[PDB]
Specification:
The protein is mainly alpha-helical and 114 residues long. The chain has one domain: Orthogonal Bundle (Arc Repressor Mutant, subunit A). It starts with a helix and ends with a helix. Bound molecules: calcium ion. It is classed as structural genomics, unknown function.
Length: 114
Amino acid sequence: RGGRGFRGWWLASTILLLVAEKPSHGYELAERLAEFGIEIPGIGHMGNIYRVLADLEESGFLSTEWDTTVSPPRKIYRITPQGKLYLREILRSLEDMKRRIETLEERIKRVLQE
Ligand SMILES: [Ca+2]
């Protein structure tokens, strides 16, 4: 079985986006996911791209079509209109998260002034 928690959410979210930005296969996604990395304490990683792709596909946020012009053939993932709606839900939560970080930032500056 797979990875969960915040890292889980942050991986799915990032993968969906990277797919929205350019439809692609598992292997290439990994490269763009690597150069993603982390400004986020403790997360890393990143890892099973393939299985969260299959997961986002099963859930209908992504569709698939084989590119047979290359060898070996590569299965291309593409965002669906549902996947875009799931994305707006991630977007609103990123705005939640960002507001929460800024309330801490200020709280901290106040005790550092003190
Ligand atoms: Ca298909």
